[PDB]
Design an enzyme around this catalytic site. Structure first.
Site, PDB file in Angstrom:
ATOM      1  N   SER A   1     -27.969   9.019  21.917  1.00  0.00           N
ATOM      2  CA  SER A   1     -28.965   9.740  21.135  1.00  0.00           C
ATOM      3  C   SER A   1     -28.994   9.330  19.669  1.00  0.00           C
ATOM      4  O   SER A   1     -29.900   9.758  18.946  1.00  0.00           O
ATOM      5  CB  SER A   1     -28.718  11.243  21.242  1.00  0.00           C
TER       6      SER A   1
ATOM      7  N   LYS B   1     -29.164  21.018  18.729  1.00  0.00           N
ATOM      8  CA  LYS B   1     -29.366  20.122  17.597  1.00  0.00           C
ATOM      9  C   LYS B   1     -30.251  20.765  16.541  1.00  0.00           C
ATOM     10  O   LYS B   1     -29.974  20.662  15.343  1.00  0.00           O
ATOM     11  CB  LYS B   1     -29.972  18.803  18.071  1.00  0.00           C
TER      12      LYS B   1
END
Ligand SMILES: Nc1ncnc2c1ncn2[C@@H]1O[C@H](COP(=O)(O)OP(=O)(O)OP(=O)(O)O)[C@@H](O)[C@H]1O
Ligand SMILES: Nc1ncnc2c1ncn2[C@@H]1O[C@H](COP(=O)(O)OP(=O)(O)O)[C@@H](O)[C@H]1O
Ligand SMILES: [Mg+2]
Lengths: 520, 91, 519
Positions: free
Chosen positions: C427, C470
């Site tokens: 990511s 996140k």
């Protein structure tokens, strides 16, 4: 004294074989010479109880009518043709020979396809007793063979427990997850027909006849079973379900069962066919129907809450308001690339839980002593070797096809298979890598709707690859209009149903020199 | 409780992680909701063990019974500097 | 004697009534001292211990259960909705039923406590046992009477302690399983195998169809795949500073104050003190450390009350350090203003959301080709992501600024701070590309911009998981602009309105969009 009569009366209806009756009556004579409070009396009591509880010669009255059994089988499951044909053949042979018989079947396939449920339905259809035997994680042979009577605790093993429970010599025993066993040498005696008829247990000390027991083993992968154990069993494959078959199953089986579980009624909560198709296409992707069952149960739970809380007296589920029940679609993207740039070529893979599309991306690491290839994407050793072979063959092909083209022999090329988190292996992408490298070298994109698979050798010969069914399904889903397969997979491709392959302009090849013509 | 001639004794158990069902017995002994109904293999009449005070010590907190860690409060005891140990030895 | 009377209040199935009758008669004819006497005694002890057919009277009133659930816990909309659906389905069925729920999320967010609240609301009995250290089938499925010191697993103990055929059983921290207990759990969790669960010690099968199972875990990735197909995944969210303060004020301060024996008249904790505790003293996604701080300060306040040092205490930020010491985590981010080489990124681990920085520098000065040294305990997947990012950064720089020779010649060192903490995941690809390009051009990125998302070889941004955590961590770190892959739009907007209030959100498909946004 009355315990002797209690043990004796159990043998009136049974037909005890000679070698068992000798043990039984010698223990009967022995028991009379022991005082009640002695421990030897206790162990003899337990041994007599175990011997006299075994159903010697008791057989369940099987039904041998093919029509009734077939009606039962279709009543419970959809489209498992191979298992149903096997059971019909079993019943036919039993009827023809005029006596019951035992067999060792092994239903293996992806999870959620209904192996345990079809085994239960077979037991119901054959009017045999049913028993679960979970070998998954078992590590001690004592579960199958027991211990000697001398020890304070003693077991006749799980098989004799089954014999006592089912009260028949010919039950249906489900031995699941034989591929997740820790040990296995005890199973050989249990299911070897040369010695299955005289299975000896360490507690009973007398062999029982298990030749009439119908053993149905279930597994997820076939290679993990030990070869001697795999040799004694008949491997029957249960395949995954296409979207059409999953829709049929959901309409006919999953939805009514989930409604019964949730207590709903058809007039209260109706689930449209297009809603089921949308759930299958976008909300879950698997070979089985486990996730689809969860989605149906969630929809019916939401409907039940709306009914009970007084929000509405009835609910209708449509694709317009399906998101209000199961949220936004989790799988919505179909293809990574709609129009492929020159360096990328569409490919196919036999991934877990059905086949899936992969792409092969290539790009220069450096502008303009020979070149080198860097491969990334969590490729396995075999796939790295396939990449090396593909690079060498691409070099050799471009040497003799376009001698002036110096691109591949000097350029530094990075090759990547997207979605790097998922490990990838297998030589299936041998030709895809060659096509990607050649398209990069020639600076020309491949046909925009072309897909291919097939192992490539060093001289360009295309070798067959497995999972043609899954790769064909994946190509059909993604919108591929032209597919390239090795020529030796011709029968594999043509063995599929008509509704799976009608839209594909399939090409069968023996060498890469004609894949080059097809792709460009 | 007999030899200490008291109704609310203070009991210390040491090295609680070196235990091998005695573990379930000590777990239920640490539960105040049932200590008022304590009964053993010898006496047929229950004894109310609610008033007792329990302290436990061990070198590490990873004692084999899991439901011990949430029932006992973690208090850490730290080492001594050389001057501290000098004074302790002198006294 | 008393063993026969215990079965009179129960509904004993025949297949165990006959077994217990035979074993009791055998014990009655056996002596009173032998070892087999002891074995038979124990076997009939657990035979008669479990409450055959004794159900618990569940409450099916939707309103009262909803009120209890709302009173006990803040937030947790998904769990409350699931329980309301459960009660409605039980009403329609006209009988009790049992499902298998699973709660997963960062530790200290209230997964265990909401199970206790559900049990209280449903009037079912509650029991909790962990399987984190489970390594053999025996401790869950039991040991056979043959072996020395056999025990009937844990589920039988659950039944005997709860005195209920339909209790609530909480299996905790299932995400860690030793090398096989997973098969035993699958045998326990299978709905078809529930009705005939057979313990090794207690040979007679028991009916577990009516029990309600709740599974607690931190991450769903490590849960075995066969177990995931059996259980329903429900996510428990992290908390922003507002939610942390609300939870603290409503629950943590009163409960801890009552536990210390004080009351509101003696020890008052001002909201400013709680805000300072949340922002500085406790850097976490849950309230595990905040509760400890509150308990510490209330305990010290009680000690002050007893000694007569003060008749009452008012905790204020000025005297807070006299209770809980000096501040920790005094700086929000290690980089308040990012130099040209670094780009802020977002991370998702088992402990909730987190923020990471990607650092780049020259190993040796400029004037054969460049190279990239990667450090920071990066995993194989993240190393491959770094290689892909380096290749794509070179390709993008050779076309956006063809005259720029920086990336093809210079030697770059790539570092991610907190070198002790291992890191993995693809990511961070876009973050690495942005860091490399910012170093090459010498231009810093937007000073409050954070990004996440896998990047392919041709620059296409692929979706990543854990967008919710996140985003929570990014909001905690005080960012104002966030860049996400376009395929995560369906997952980002499921957040609450106040979570994504101040964030200027950009959804991208190809890296050129991120390059336009960042510079
Ligand atoms: N053809 C079918 N028709 C109707 N229902 C089906 C069919 N195939 C599967 N199912 C249903 O799907 C579910 C699968 O459950 P089951 O335990 O039988 O699966 P499995 O693949 O044998 O499992 P495992 O590999 O875990 O042992 C059941 O609810 C079953 O009824
Ligand atoms: N939403 C919430 N409402 C009320 N209390 C909460 C909430 N979230 C966490 N808590 C508090 O946090 C404490 C610790 O939670 P815990 O049960 O350890 O969570 P987990 O089981 O996820 O570790 C509990 O005592 C609980 O009171
Ligand atoms: Mg199975």
């Amino acid at each position: 004294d009355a315990i002797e009569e209690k043990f004796r009366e159990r043998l009136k209806e049974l037909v005890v074989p000679k070698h068992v009756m000798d043990v039984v009556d010698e223990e009967l004579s022995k028991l009379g010479l022991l005082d009640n409070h002695s421990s030897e009396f206790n162990v003899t009591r337990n041994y007599l109880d175990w011997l006299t509880s075994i159903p010697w010669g008791k057989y369940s009255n099987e039904n041998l009518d093919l029509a009734r059994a077939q009606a039962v089988l279709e009543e419970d499951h959809y489209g498992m043709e191979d298992v149903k044909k096997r059971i019909l053949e079993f019943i036919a042979v039993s009827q023809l020979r005029g006596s019951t018989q035992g067999k060792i079947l092994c239903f293996y396939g992806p999870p959620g396809v209904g192996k345990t449920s079809i085994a239960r339905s077979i037991a119901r259809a054959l009017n045999r007793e049913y028993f679960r035997f979970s070998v998954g994680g078992m590590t001690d042979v004592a579960e199958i063979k027991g211990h000697r009577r001398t020890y304070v605790g003693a077991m006749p093993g799980k098989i004799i427990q089954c014999l006592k429970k089912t009260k028949t010599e010919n039950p249906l025993i489900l031995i699941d997850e034989v591929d997740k066993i820790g040990p296995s040498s005890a199973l050989l005696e249990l299911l070897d027909p040369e010695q299955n008829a005289n299975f000896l247990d360490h507690y009973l000390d007398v062999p029982v006849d298990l030749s009439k027991v119908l053993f149905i083993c279930t597994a997820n992968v076939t290679d993990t079973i030990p070869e001697p154990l795999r040799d004694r069993m008949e491997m029957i494959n249960v395949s995954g379900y296409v979207a059409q078959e999953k829709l049929a199953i959901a309409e006919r089986y999953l939805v009514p069962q989930a409604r019964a579980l949730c207590g709903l009624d058809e007039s209260k909560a109706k689930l449209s066919s297009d809603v089921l198709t949308l759930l299958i296409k976008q909300y879950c992707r698997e070979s089985g129907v486990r996730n689809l069952q969860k989605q149906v149960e969630k929809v019916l739970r939401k409907s039940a809450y709306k009914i009970v809380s007084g929000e509405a007296e009835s609910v209708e589920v449509t694709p317009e308001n399906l998101q209000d029940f199961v949220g936004k679609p989790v799988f919505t993207v179909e293809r990574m690339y709609d129009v492929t740039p020159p360096g990328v070529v569409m490919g196919l893979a036999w991934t877990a839980m059905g086949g899936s599309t992969l792409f092969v991306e290539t790009s220069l690491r450096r502008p303009q002593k020979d070149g080198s290839l860097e491969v990334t994407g969590q490729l396995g050793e075999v796939m790295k070797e396939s990449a090396r072979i593909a690079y060498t063959f691409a070099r050799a092909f471009l040497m003799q096809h376009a001698p002036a083209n110096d691109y591949l022999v000097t350029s530094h090329i990075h090759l990547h298979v997207p979605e790097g988190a998922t490990p990838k292996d297998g030589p299936s992408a041998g030709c895809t890598i060659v096509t990607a490298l050649l398209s990069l070298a020639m600076g020309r994109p491949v046909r925009q709707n072309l897909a291919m698979t097939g192992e490539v050798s060093l001289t360009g010969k295309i070798l067959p690859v497995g999972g043609i069914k899954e790769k064909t399904i994946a190509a059909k889903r993604a919108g591929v209009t032209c597919i390239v397969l090795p020529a030796e997979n011709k029968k594999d491709f043509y063995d599929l149903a008509a509704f799976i392959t009608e839209g594909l302009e399939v090409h069968f090849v023996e060498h890469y020199r004609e894949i080059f013509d097809i792709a460009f | 409780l007999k030899k200490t001639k008291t109704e609310n004794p203070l009991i210390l158990i040491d090295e609680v992680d070196k235990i091998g069902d005695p573990s379930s017995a000590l777990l239920e002994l640490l539960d105040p909701e049932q200590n008022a109904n304590f009964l053993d293999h010898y006496l047929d009449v229950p004894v109310d063990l609610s008033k007792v005070l329990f302290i436990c010590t061990a070198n590490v907190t990873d004692t084999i019974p899991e439901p011990l860690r949430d029932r006992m409060e973690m208090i850490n005891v730290s080492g001594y500097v050389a001057q501290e140990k000098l004074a302790i030895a002198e006294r």
